[PDB]
Ligand binder design. Structure first.
Ligand code: CA
Ligand code: CA
Length: 238
């Protein structure tokens, strides 16, 4: 049915384009919608100015939010109570609500929906246990690729064959990219887990430190360095 619904101001923020590119959305005004989270989809409804919005109302459009991240943007230069959803495709959207409490409720509801979607995917009754398990798996994968990358870097100046060296450099950059993906997934699952346990979300500054040089260059092009743009860039690769 409906997990969460409310009136929000909404603005497209980042947009996924062909060839795995993220671009900033056009400079534009906020628009108000009745936004309703059902399953793992946000439905956006416009008011006709005289009737309410119910099950027989037809949405203007819908945003699929499976495997999304939502972040408060208290740093937003002009508006309070802004949060940002970045989806699994490389898109992101800004939303403005009415208070800190309501903002936190939207973050909780969307992450809960995402957590349920992950459980659906794995056929697990225990959503909490599954999240912790996936977290453990990601930490194991991170440990391995970190170690392989460290070995590779130490090997770079010991291999005398130029083809061999070039191969190792390629691999270092593969591992670097893998680690960006893994850290993003880990942060995301920690967001989901926190939302179910009522705990605090993982530290955004810690995640950003894992952005590689090419990813930072891309964030510079976008005009935004944040968990949301980092996520959009990573998601656009898949
Ligand atoms: Ca259960
Ligand atoms: Ca990869």
């Amino acid at each position: 049915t409906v997990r969460k619904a409310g009136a929000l101001a909404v603005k497209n923020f980042l947009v996924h384009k062909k060839n795995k590119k993220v671009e900033s959305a056009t400079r534009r005004k906020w628009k108000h919608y009745w936004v309703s989270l059902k399953g793992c989809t946000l439905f956006f409804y416009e008011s006709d100015g005289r009737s309410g919005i119910d099950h027989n109302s037809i949405p203007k459009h819908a945003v699929w939010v499976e495997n999304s991240i939502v972040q408060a943007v208290p740093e937003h230069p002009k508006k309070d109570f802004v949060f940002c959803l970045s989806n699994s495709l490389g898109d992101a959207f800004l939303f403005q609500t009415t208070s800190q409490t309501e903002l936190e409720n939207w973050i909780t509801a969307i992450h809960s929906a995402c957590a349920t979607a992950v459980a659906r995917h794995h056929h697990k009754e225990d959503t909490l246990r599954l999240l912790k398990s996936e977290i453990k798996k990601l930490e194991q994968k991170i440990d391995m690729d970190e170690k392989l990358k460290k070995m590779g870097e130490l090997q770079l100046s010991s291999v005398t064959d130029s083809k061999a060296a070039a191969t190792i450099l390629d691999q270092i950059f593969v591992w670097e990219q893998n680690l960006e993906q893994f850290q993003m997934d880990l942060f995301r699952f920690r967001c989901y887990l926190a939302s179910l346990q009522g705990g605090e979300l993982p530290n955004p500054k810690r995640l950003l430190a894992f952005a590689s040089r090419p990813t930072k260059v891309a964030m510079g092009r976008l005009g935004i360095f944040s968990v949301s743009s980092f996520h959009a860039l990573v998601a656009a690769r898949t």
